[PDB]
């Protein structure tokens, strides 16, 4: 694109490689995704409205000679490796909470727009050192659908799935981000991941075995669903205190609100962020290492 130049490769997304670029007459600094339809130009212009504190904010949407580029706020740096870079002695508690805290907000955003995002992970969520957090890529899976690999063929993570998609159903709703931000707020405590599975059955018997195989008790309508299996191995759930220790009362109950099986039962963001558990709630400065 004439109109940037790019500084050097800072992600290999779902859709395309992304950028560090600079813009040659605002001076601006921009995250830059090439992408690889009508209906996907329509959904994308939409995105452009959808502006919140915690959206990565979409500056711009360049088609050109078939070739579609997304101009996005930067961050520099992401989650998965903030927490990578905190595996010694984790993230501290009250940095963890402002980070739910402000996720939650931009989801209540983005939901009560009917804006879901479809594939929240560490990787996707950017910070700044001004405390901030913001969700990248919201939308874009509606506007291309999420593939099996990445376009160099790196898997797509399955950790952070809803169990509804797992198990096949066609119209899920907002509930599925929540599941996902739920499984990032086990893993910001505990430094690991919730249910690392390594295929959608490894994915879905990780979950089973956590939160016990799902029946018509405690998810109604579980058995019809498409890719439900009477077969399944039936597993107990394991109390919370011991998966998300030392994760305290509040937030263990946030936690299991989260990741209700029945997505109608499952907590709203809206409702989350009445949650006791942000009762005392601040808003911190981590430091990073630019
Ligand atoms: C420096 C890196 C973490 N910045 C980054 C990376 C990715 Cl994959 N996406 C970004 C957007 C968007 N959208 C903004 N900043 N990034």
Redesign the pocket.
Known sequence: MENFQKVEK??E?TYGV?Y?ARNKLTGEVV?L?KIRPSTAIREISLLKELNHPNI?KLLDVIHTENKLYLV???????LKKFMDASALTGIPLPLIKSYLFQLLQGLAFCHSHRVLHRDLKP??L?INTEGAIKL??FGLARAFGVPVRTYTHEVVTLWYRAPEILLGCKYYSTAVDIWSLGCIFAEMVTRRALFPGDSEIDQLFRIFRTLGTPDEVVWPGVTSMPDYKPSFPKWARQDFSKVVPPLDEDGRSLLSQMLHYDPNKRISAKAALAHPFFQDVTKPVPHLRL
């Not at 996005?72 to 992401?78: I, N, R, S, T, V």
């Open positions: 800072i992600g997304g992304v560090k995250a995704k990565v996005f706020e930067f961050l520099h740096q992401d990787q996707n950017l990248a890529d």
